[PDB]
């Protein structure tokens, strides 16, 4: 449930 909310923040950090 809240396991993807963790990597989601980092996935965007580099997606920039």
Write the layout of secondary structure elements.
Elements: H1 7-15
In short:
The protein is mainly α. The protein has one helix at residues 7-15. It is classed as viral protein.
Alpha-carbon Rg, integer: 8 Å
Largest sheet: none
Helix content: 55-70%
Q: By helix and strand content, what is the structural category?
A: mainly alpha
Order of helices and strands: H
Distance between the termini: 25 Å
Strand content: under 5%
The geometry reads as rod-shaped
* Strand element count: 0
Total helical segments: 1
Function: Acts as a viral fusion peptide which is unmasked following S2 cleavage occurring upon virus endocytosis.
Protein name: Spike protein S2'
What does the model show?
- The chain is mainly α and 16 residues long.
- The protein is 56% helix and 0% strand.
- The protein has one helix at 7-15.
Summary tags:
monomer; mainly alpha; SARS-CoV; viral protein; 16 residues; Internal fusion peptide; Spike protein S2'; 1 helix
